[PDB]
Write a protein that binds this DNA or RNA. Sequence first.
RNA 1: GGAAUACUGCCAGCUGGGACUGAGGACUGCGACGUAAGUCAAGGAUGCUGGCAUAAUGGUUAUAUGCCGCCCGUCUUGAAACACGGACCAAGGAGUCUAACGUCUAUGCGAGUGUUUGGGUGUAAAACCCAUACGCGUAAUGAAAGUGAACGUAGGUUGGGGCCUCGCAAGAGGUGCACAAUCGACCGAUCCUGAUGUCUUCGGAUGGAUUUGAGUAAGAGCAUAGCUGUUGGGACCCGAAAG
RNA 2: AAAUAUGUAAGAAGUCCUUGUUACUUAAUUGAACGUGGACAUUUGAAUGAAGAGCUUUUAGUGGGCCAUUUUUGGUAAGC
RNA 3: GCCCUGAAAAUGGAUGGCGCUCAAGCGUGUUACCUAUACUCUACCGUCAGGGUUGAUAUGAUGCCCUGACGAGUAGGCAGG
Lengths: 185, 50, 159, 51, 58, 148, 223
Amino acid sequence: GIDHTSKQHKRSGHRTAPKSDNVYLKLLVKLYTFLARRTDAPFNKVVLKALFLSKINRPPVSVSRIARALKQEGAANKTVVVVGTVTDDARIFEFPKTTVAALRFTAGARAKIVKAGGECITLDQLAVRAPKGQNTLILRGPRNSREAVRHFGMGPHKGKAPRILSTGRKFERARGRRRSKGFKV
Amino acid sequence: AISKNLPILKNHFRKHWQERVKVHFDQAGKKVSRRNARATRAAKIAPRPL
Amino acid sequence: GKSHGYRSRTRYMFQRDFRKHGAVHLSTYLKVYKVGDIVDIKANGSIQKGMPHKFYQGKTGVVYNVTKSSVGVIINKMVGNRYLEKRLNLRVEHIKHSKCRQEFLERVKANAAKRAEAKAQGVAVQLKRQPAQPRESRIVSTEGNVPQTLAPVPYETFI
Amino acid sequence: VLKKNPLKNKQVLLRLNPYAKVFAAEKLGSKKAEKTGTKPAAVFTETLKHD
Amino acid sequence: AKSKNHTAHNQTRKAHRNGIKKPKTYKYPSLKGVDPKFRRNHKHALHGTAKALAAAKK
Amino acid sequence: PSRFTKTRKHRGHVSAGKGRIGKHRKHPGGRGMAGGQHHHRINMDKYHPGYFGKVGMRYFHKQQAHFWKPVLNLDKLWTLIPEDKRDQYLKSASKETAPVIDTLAAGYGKILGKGRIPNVPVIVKARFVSKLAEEKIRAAGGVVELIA
Amino acid sequence: TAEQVAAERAARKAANKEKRAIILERNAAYQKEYETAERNIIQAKRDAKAAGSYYVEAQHKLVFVVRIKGINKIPPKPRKVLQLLRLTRINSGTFVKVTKATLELLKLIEPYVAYGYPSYSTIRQLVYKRGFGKINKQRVPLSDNAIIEANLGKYGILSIDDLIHEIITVGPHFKQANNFLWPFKLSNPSGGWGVPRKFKHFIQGGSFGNREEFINKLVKSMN
RNA sequence: GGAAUACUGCCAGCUGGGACUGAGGACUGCGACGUAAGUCAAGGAUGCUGGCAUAAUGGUUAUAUGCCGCCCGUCUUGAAACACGGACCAAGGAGUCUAACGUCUAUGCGAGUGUUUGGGUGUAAAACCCAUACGCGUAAUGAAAGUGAACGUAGGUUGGGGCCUCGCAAGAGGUGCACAAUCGACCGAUCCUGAUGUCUUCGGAUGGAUUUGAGUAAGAGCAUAGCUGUUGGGACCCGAAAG
RNA sequence: AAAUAUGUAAGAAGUCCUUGUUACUUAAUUGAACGUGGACAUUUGAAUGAAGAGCUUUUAGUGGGCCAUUUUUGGUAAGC
RNA sequence: GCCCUGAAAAUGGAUGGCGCUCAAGCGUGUUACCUAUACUCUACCGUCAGGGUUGAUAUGAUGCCCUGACGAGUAGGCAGG
C-alpha cells in the first residue's frame, strides 16, 4: 500500500479537443495544434485551447468592443483576433479600419468592418500572415453577462436573483423581502 | 415536495386532464379540406370573388 | 433543560487574577491602535461593555477600524470545513498589542541595518533564521575533574 | 530499457565515475594507516578500570 | 424506541477532505463596518489625489 | 432517445439508482408544495424569499396595454431611419432638411436618454420623453414634437 | 551537411572527455577529503586521550530514515509527518538533515520508523544501486552522469559522486539535492529483522527509533 | 616488554554452487580495452548440439489425490442463521410518456430570434414557399401615481493571458480583453435640501446621506436538440383497513 | 498549577527617504488614511513537503450505526 | 517464586486435537528455520500524467510512438462496450 495523498487516476478538468463535430473546426484545430507545437509563440497555444471552448465560454465579441480596444495607444494598426463570433453594434458611429480575424462574422458586423475600408479574415488566413501571431490583439467577450449567472449564489443577503417564472408584485415580494413582512432577505 | 434552487412551477394537471387532450393529427388533412372547400365554393360562385 | 446563555461556562475565564481586582490602570487607555495592528483578545470581567464573546478569548486578530473607545478586530473563525471572517467591536480594556509582532518589526529593522552594513563592505548578507544545530566537536579536560563515578541506590522505606 | 547496476557490471561502474580505475589500481580500498605511538594518560586508564 | 442523541464522530474527517484551506484575502478589503465619517472624508481625500495626479499629465 | 438513457445502464443492479436504505417511495414529504411554512421552510426562505403573504394594492380588471408604452433609447434611435438614407443625413446635418422620425410608427411609446447620439439635427415625434432624452436631442439641434 | 556533422559531433566528443576529466579530479579530491577528515577524528581522540582529556565527536548532521510500519491505523499527526518526509509506503526510506526543526519530526514519527547514522559505504551503495531522480514528476534511474548535471548542475553537482558528496557532507544544497533523490524503495531485510517483534524500540529489543550506527547493517541487508 | 587472536567495520579484492527472467528488434547513446587496424560483458540472448511423427507438445473434459470453499436474494450495527422469499422449467414481468422548467452541451442565426394558427404549394399527413401579428429578448425601479441610466478615452486603484518595444540572452519598459477584489459616477425607491418661477399652491431646479433595488456603465439573446435533475400526472411495479 | 490539546506572527499586499490629497483630526501640515517620486531583490527574511495551484455550476446516495485503547457520567452490575 | 488448599451444575468433551513431566509446562537468553493478495526486481492488462510525430513523403490524427506513476470498494455518480 501507498498512503496516497492525492486522488488517483484523476484527470485534468481540461478539454482536449472541441466537443464539436464541425469538420472545419477540426481542421482549424489540426492547424493550430501544429503551430502551437512547432513554434515557441504563446499566441498559438492560446488560440489552440480557445478552439476547444464551449459556446458559453465563447461569448460574442462586439464591433464596438473592437472599436474601443483599438483606441488603446500603440494599438491602432494591430490585427484583432476573436476565437469566436463578432456581432454588429448600431451604437458606435465612427468605425476604424483594421482587420478582424474571427470564427464567424454576423452580416451586420461583416459589413461594418468592410464599409470602413477594413477587412474580414478567417483564422487559417490569420495563420499565414502571422504564424507567430505577430501584431495581434486577442479579445474576449463578457462571460458573466450571461443571464444564467444572475441566479448563481442565490442565498440570504447575497443580493442575487430568484429563479422566478413570472415576475411582478404578488411574486416573491412579500414575506422575507421587506421589514414589514416578517423580515428582509 | 420542495427541494433545490429551482423555479416554483404551476402545472395545472391535477384534474383528469387525460380525457380532454386534443392532438392535431388532422392539421394536414383539414388544410386539404379547407382548400377543396375553397375551390369548390369559388366554382359555383360563378365569377364572383369568394 | 440545557443552558447556553452568552456568558455560560465563563465562571473562571472572565474572572480577575488573585489580588488584581478593582480599577484598571491608566496604561491600558494610553495605548494607541492603528488599522492593521495585531491585537490579542483578553476580556476584562470588570468592564462589562464592549466585551468579547467567550469564543474570542485568547484569540488574536487584525485591527480594521478605530472608534471613540473601541477597536474593530478581524478574527478568522472556523465553522464547518471553512474559515469565516468575523468583525468584533471590542472596547480597549479587552485588548493588547501582540508582543511577537513587535518582535517582528524589530527584526525587520535589524535585517535592514545588517543588509546596509553588508553592502557597505560589499560582502555577503545571510539574514534567515536557522534552527538549533547538532553541535561541533569538543575536548573536555580532566584537570580538577576526574569523573566521580556513580551507581544505582538500594531501596529503603522512610515512613 | 533495463537498469544495470554499477556494483556489478564494471562497464557501468566506469561509465558513471571513472577514478574507480585508479581507485582499484592504487588499491586504497585497503591502504595501511600511518603508525603512531601516542599512549594515554594515567588518569585515563585509572578511571577506565575504576570500580 | 430510543436512539443515538449526538456525536462529533467522523465530523472532522468529513471536514478535512476539501476542508479548511484558509480565508480568501485581498489588498483593499471590505470596508464593512469602518467609521462612516472617515469613509466620507476619505472619498474627498481620494478624489483630490486623482485630480492633482492627472493634473501632472494635463 | 431511450437507448441513451441511464436506466439502460442500471439494469441488473438492484434497486435502480435509488438506494437500499432510503428506497424510492411514493411522495415522502408530500405532494406539490406541501408545508412550505413547516417542514420545507428552510428551502422556501432563501431560494424563495418573498413567497408568502401580501404586498400592495389590488387592481380589479387590470387591462394590460392600457400601459402599452415601449421604450427606445437615444442609444439606438438612428436605427429607425432607413439605413440607406442614414448616411445622407449624417453627412448633411442641416436644420432645414433634418430627417423626421415617427417613433410611434416604429411601435414605440417613450424615448429614454441612455447613450449618445451625434451632433446632427433630428425631428423626433413621440408620445412621452424623459427630460434627459429631450435635452440631448435639443443639444444636437433637434426637437421633440409631442404626438398621440 | 556531410562535413558539419563531424563538426558538431567532435564538439561533444571533446566536451565529454573534458567533463569526464573534471569528474575524475573531483572524485579524487573527495577520496582524499574523506581519507583525511576521518584519520583526523581518530588521532584527535588519541591525542585527547594522551593529554588526559576526552575528545567528543561532533553530533551527526545526517540520518537515513526507513518506514517499517504499514499504512493502516496510523494517527493523523504522525501520518502527516511520515508524508512530509516522503515515507508513505513501508520499507521506503530517505535522508534527513538533522536540525532541531527536523528532530522533533523524528520524535513524533518514531514508532513507525527505523533510523540512524549512515556510513559512506551505505550511502554510496544506496545511490548507486537504487538512486533515482525526480524530473518532471517522473522517477528516472541515475544511469548516466548527464542526468544529474542536467538537473542539479546549477549547484555544482555534475556527477553521481558529487551527488553522494553533497549528501554525506550535508552542506549548501542538501535540500534540493536530497529532494532530487526519489524516496529509496528498499526490500525487506534479507536475513530478517533479527528481533522477534519489530514494534518495540531498538533499546527495548526490537526495531523502530534511533539505532544510531546500526542503521547501516539493517539498510545494507535491505538494499 | 614484544606479539598474536577475538569483536566490529571498510575494499570501485578474487572467486565456486543453485535458482527465476531473456521484455526489445536496422543504425543513432555514455563508455571500456587496445600503439594500432581493431575489439567489448558498453541504450534488454546468443552460440553449439540433439529430440518429436498414426509423435513431442498444448487445449478441453471426466475421475482421483492434496489443500481450500456454509445459500442465494434481502432488511440490518450485525445472516450460513433457530430472520423472510425461493420445489422445478419455459414464456411474460418494473423509472415510462407528457405539460411546464434548472443546469450543462451541440447547432442555427444574432440585437435580435421563432417557416408549420393560418396561407401558398405539392411527386399529398412529406418535401418546397410566405404576409400580418404574437412570444421571448434589447430597462429598470416603486405598493402605486410615476420617473427612468456617460463629470471622465464609459472613471480611479491592484492583480492580469496575449500582443508591442529594448535587449544576444536574463531582463526591463508599454499595452493591457476575460475574470477578481476595492474606491467612484448614472437610473429608480426612501429620507433630506427647496433655486429660477407660478394664478398662493402649484411647480421641483440643484446639492445630499452607516438606507434600499432581481438596474446602468460599447448589448446576448432567441430557437431546435440531448443526458441528468424538478413539479403535476396511474407516474418505477405490485399491495390496505376504508369512502 | 502541569502534560496533551489551542490563537497569531516569521515581509513585495515588505522596508526606508522625499513630499502630495482631504470637507476627517490636531493648538498647529499636527495627525490619520491613501498616494506621486527616489532607493533596496545572491539567504527576499525559520524547517519539511507540494504528488500543480486557484475557481464556478450542478446532481446522487446518506441523514437507524456499531466496535477498540484512552478520558469519562448514570447503575450493584451487564454482551447495559 | 512455582506448587498445594480455599475451587459446587445439570447430553459426553475439549491448552484446537493428539499427547507432553531435565516438557512438547513456567521465567530468561542466543542462533537457525517456516509463511500473506505486504516489501524488492521483471513481463503483461488497464487507468492517469508528461512528451514526440502527418515536412513531399499509401493502410488507423479521436492515430503511431516515448516516458513515469498508479490499481480495495457497498449506497451512489460518470465512462467505454
